[PDB]
Amino acid sequence: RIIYCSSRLPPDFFGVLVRDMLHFYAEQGDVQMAVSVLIVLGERVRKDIDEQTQEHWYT
Amino acid sequence: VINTVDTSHEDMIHDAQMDYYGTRLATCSSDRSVKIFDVRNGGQILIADLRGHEGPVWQVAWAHPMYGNILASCSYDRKVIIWREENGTWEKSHEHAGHDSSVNSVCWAPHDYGLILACGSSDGAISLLTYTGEGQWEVKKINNAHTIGCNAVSWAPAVVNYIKRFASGGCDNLIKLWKEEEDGQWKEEQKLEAHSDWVRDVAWAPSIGLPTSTIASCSQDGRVFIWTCDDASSNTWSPKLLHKFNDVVWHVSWSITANILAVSGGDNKVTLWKESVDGQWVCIS
Amino acid sequence: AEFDIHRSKLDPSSKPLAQVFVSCNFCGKSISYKVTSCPGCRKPLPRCALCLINMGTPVLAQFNNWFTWCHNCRHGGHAGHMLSWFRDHAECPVSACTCKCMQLDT
Amino acid sequence: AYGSYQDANIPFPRTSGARFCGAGYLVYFTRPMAAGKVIIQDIACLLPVHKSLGELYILNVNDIQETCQKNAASALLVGRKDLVQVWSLATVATDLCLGPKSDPDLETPWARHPFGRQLLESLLAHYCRLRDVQTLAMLCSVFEAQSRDPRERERDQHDKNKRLLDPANTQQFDDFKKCYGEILYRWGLREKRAEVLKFVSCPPDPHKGIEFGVYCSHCRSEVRGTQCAICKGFTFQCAICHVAVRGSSNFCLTCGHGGHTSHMMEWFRTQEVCPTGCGCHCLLESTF
Ligand SMILES: [Zn+2]
Ligand SMILES: [Zn+2]
Ligand SMILES: [Zn+2]
Ligand SMILES: [Zn+2]
Ligand SMILES: [Zn+2]
Ligand SMILES: [Zn+2]
Ligand SMILES: [Zn+2]
Ligand SMILES: [Zn+2]
């Protein structure tokens, strides 16, 4: 909420961190958290993950 | 804002520097005198007017407040004079005349090393004056430091006992690094050769903990060079040209964070430079 | 205190004795003072913890130029600086020191 | 002879100069084109540090959330927005409920989470590129303050992994803190310097030089401490309240008498003689 719902930081300063957080949560079998975050964020992070991984998590 | 101060000297000003707190100012001129003012709340109060030199005065330098109120001046009379303030009045407290030619530059060491003064003269020898206590000094002379004569001296920021290093620039168009050995003797460490004319000033940028060493050099020919070392293991320096000015470049100074460079040259103009993100240096004024 | 002053003025034989002496921790020699540096080892006086100024260097409110010393933490400094620091904090201002020198006495 | 043929090695004298001085001042002079003037200009709008923020920041070891919230509020007041965002993130990321566990097998330490050590490293890298020593020192203080046989090797690795600050780079953080402390001291603020320096991992060395000892009030022996080693009693007693003194104290080097700081302050507020009757004007013999 702090990161997204807002002499400033670069506009996409946190993209890599969010992607790595999603991967970290999905790499230990906790698909629920990753899918929930993906649905909630929507287009703000959709383009940083390849379609195959998204389909794998959803299924 | 702006504060304008009237020197009231009788001839041209050659250098001016404030104290460590930014509350007092010391100027030097060809009138063989040194004026010390107070500039609190934008005022001009002539605190002191000292005359002890028999010739023109080139540079002055304040010491760290940790050791009190100490000023050092180098003059054309082949003399360096130290002024100290006791009981609210300034007075000459020591004198050194170990050189045979005009002394051009003076600089205080970082306060961690103690109270050490480094002088550089045209005779080609560099004198280090170490404070021994009880109002007594020790003198160490590095003779034949440069081919013709030294012009600028700059200490290096202290890093973790300790290792003392500084840089010197003379009339040989070469920059020479100097490091203190464990015994106490000083040995030349490395040489840098990129200028084509007399080297007039060198300034070693302050440190904030980043693993990078930076030195700025300006010379007679108008070249300004930034020497960078990104690895203390290699001890290698890669010069870059900042800009080529049409006239002589006299003095270069760093900011406290070593991110802005101030250049004053023979064109009677002052410029400010900042490093771009792309690694280039661009003017500000 | 006034009675003691009167007694001392009338009786000189009832003078009290000194309480604090000066001894170097390096030369190990007792020092009688004032004195600028160690007579033997030339080591200077301890510096103020907040102003980093050596003791004995100059600069009503003249009392502020005294040296407050804490025999527990063996630290000290200028009276005004130390009092101002302790007015809002409750620890020895020196790093890695935990003595509450002012709050200890009560 | 000045300017003669013997001075071929002496460079031509300067007539203009510009130099940084103080913490936010530029001092320069130029050829008049009867001597010129000297110009002092304030350039605080160029450096990556602010004096007002230095005056407004606080660092309480006991409470972290309060410090983070107040720092965020002050940063908002000044006009920096990235600082507000960073301070809010630090507020969330340093809560007490994320405390590490002793047993490595219970849960993944929060330092391993990508919103922990990696985020901190990214912020540090960005501000190192910006050369903002103030923010670096503040962050390296706040996050550090939270720290407060194969089995042995695994436990040591777990201990080394549960810290948001990489132990391999303690020196860089200490250098950040020292540089910011020196800047604060140059600014004239002293208490903030001590507060910042209280977070340095490396302690300094004790003063090697003149020390003060006290004559025992009972055995009159030289005792280096608040308690005697022979009589086992208190060696220093106040000259006013006649109570044992254990904390801060003041004494006259000329007369050798002293006691409690507040007591002696009250006594010398109005009086000018040594309160023990020694006849020494301790004020004039002490205030050198
Ligand atoms: Zn001694
Ligand atoms: Zn103590
Ligand atoms: Zn202490
Ligand atoms: Zn003090
Ligand atoms: Zn005893
Ligand atoms: Zn006395
Ligand atoms: Zn007395
Ligand atoms: Zn008392």
UniProtKB/Swiss-Prot annotation, chain A:
Signal sequence region: none
Source domain of life: Eukaryota
PTM remark: Autoubiquitinated; MIOS is required to prevent autoubiquitination.
Subcellular location: Lysosome membrane
Family of the protein in this entry: Belongs to the WD repeat WDR24 family.
Quaternary structure annotation from Swiss-Prot or TrEMBL: Component of the GATOR2 subcomplex, composed of MIOS, SEC13, SEH1L, WDR24 and WDR59. The GATOR2 complex interacts with CASTOR1 and CASTOR2; the interaction is negatively regulated by arginine. The GATOR2 complex interacts with SESN1, SESN2 and SESN3; the interaction is negatively regulated by amino acids. SESN1, SESN2 and SESN3 convey leucine availability via direct interaction with SEH1L and WDR24.
Functional note: Catalytic component of the GATOR2 complex, a multiprotein complex that acts as an activator of the amino acid-sensing branch of the mTORC1 signaling pathway. The GATOR2 complex indirectly activates mTORC1 through the inhibition of the GATOR1 subcomplex. GATOR2 probably acts as an E3 ubiquitin-protein ligase toward GATOR1. In the presence of abundant amino acids, the GATOR2 complex mediates ubiquitination of the NPRL2 core component of the GATOR1 complex, leading to GATOR1 inactivation. In the absence of amino acids, GATOR2 is inhibited, activating the GATOR1 complex.
Name listed for the protein in its UniProt record: GATOR2 complex protein WDR24
Organism: Homo sapiens (Human)
Gene this chain is encoded by: WDR24
Curated annotation (Swiss-Prot), chain B:
SMART domains: WD40
Record keyword Protein transport present: yes
Subcellular location: Cytoplasmic vesicle, COPII-coated vesicle membrane; Endoplasmic reticulum membrane; Nucleus, Nuclear pore complex; Lysosome membrane
Entry's Gene Ontology BP terms: cellular response to nutrient levels; COPII-coated vesicle budding; COPII-coated vesicle cargo loading; intracellular protein transport; mRNA transport; negative regulation of TORC1 signaling; nucleocytoplasmic transport; positive regulation of TOR signaling
GO cellular component terms, semicolon-separated: COPII vesicle coat; cytosol; endoplasmic reticulum membrane; ER to Golgi transport vesicle membrane; extracellular exosome; GATOR2 complex; intracellular membrane-bounded organelle; lysosomal membrane
Entries under InterPro entries matching the protein: Sec13/Seh1_fam, WD40/YVTN_repeat-like_dom_sf, WD40_repeat_dom_sf, WD40_rpt
Keywords: Acetylation, Cytoplasmic vesicle, Endoplasmic reticulum, ER-Golgi transport, Lysosome, Membrane, mRNA transport, Nuclear pore complex, Nucleus, Phosphoprotein, Protein transport, Repeat, Translocation, Transport, WD repeat
Protein name as it appears in the record: Protein SEC13 homolog
Gene that this sequence comes from: SEC13
Swiss-Prot record, chain C:
Binding-site residues for Zn(2+) 3, renumbered to this chain: C70, C73, C101
Domain of life per record: Eukaryota
Binding, Zn(2+) 2: C51, H78, H81
Binding site for Zn(2+) 1: C24, C27, C38, C41
Places the protein is found: Lysosome membrane
ZnF (RING-type) residues: 45-106
Chain's role: As a component of the GATOR2 complex, functions as an activator of the amino acid-sensing branch of the mTORC1 signaling pathway. The GATOR2 complex indirectly activates mTORC1 through the inhibition of the GATOR1 subcomplex. GATOR2 probably acts as an E3 ubiquitin-protein ligase toward GATOR1. In the presence of abundant amino acids, the GATOR2 complex mediates ubiquitination of the NPRL2 core component of the GATOR1 complex, leading to GATOR1 inactivation. In the absence of amino acids, GATOR2 is inhibited, activating the GATOR1 complex.
Protein name (record): GATOR2 complex protein MIOS
Swiss-Prot record, chain D:
ZnF endpoints (C4-type): 215-234
Zinc finger (RING-type): 235-287
Residues noted as binding Zn(2+) 3 in the record, renumbered to the chain: C252, C280, C282
WD repeat residue numbers: 59-97
Positions contributing to Zn(2+) 4 binding: H257, C274, C278
Positions that bind Zn(2+) 2: C241, H260, H263
Compartments, record wording: Lysosome membrane
Segments of this protein annotated with the region Disordered: 149-166
Positions with biased composition (Basic and acidic residues): 149-165
Binding site residues for Zn(2+) 1: C216, C219, C228, C231
Subunit structure: Component of the GATOR2 subcomplex, composed of MIOS, SEC13, SEH1L, WDR24 and WDR59. The GATOR2 complex interacts with CASTOR1 and CASTOR2; the interaction is negatively regulated by arginine. The GATOR2 complex interacts with SESN1, SESN2 and SESN3; the interaction is negatively regulated by amino acids. Interacts with DDB1-CUL4A/B E3 ligase complexes.
Family recorded in the similarity comment: Belongs to the WD repeat WDR59 family.
Function: As a component of the GATOR2 complex, functions as an activator of the amino acid-sensing branch of the mTORC1 signaling pathway. The GATOR2 complex indirectly activates mTORC1 through the inhibition of the GATOR1 subcomplex. GATOR2 probably acts as an E3 ubiquitin-protein ligase toward GATOR1. In the presence of abundant amino acids, the GATOR2 complex mediates ubiquitination of the NPRL2 core component of the GATOR1 complex, leading to GATOR1 inactivation. In the absence of amino acids, GATOR2 is inhibited, activating the GATOR1 complex.
Protein's recorded name: GATOR2 complex protein WDR59
Source organism per UniProt: Homo sapiens (Human)
Lineage start: Eukaryota, Metazoa, Chordata, Craniata, Vertebrata
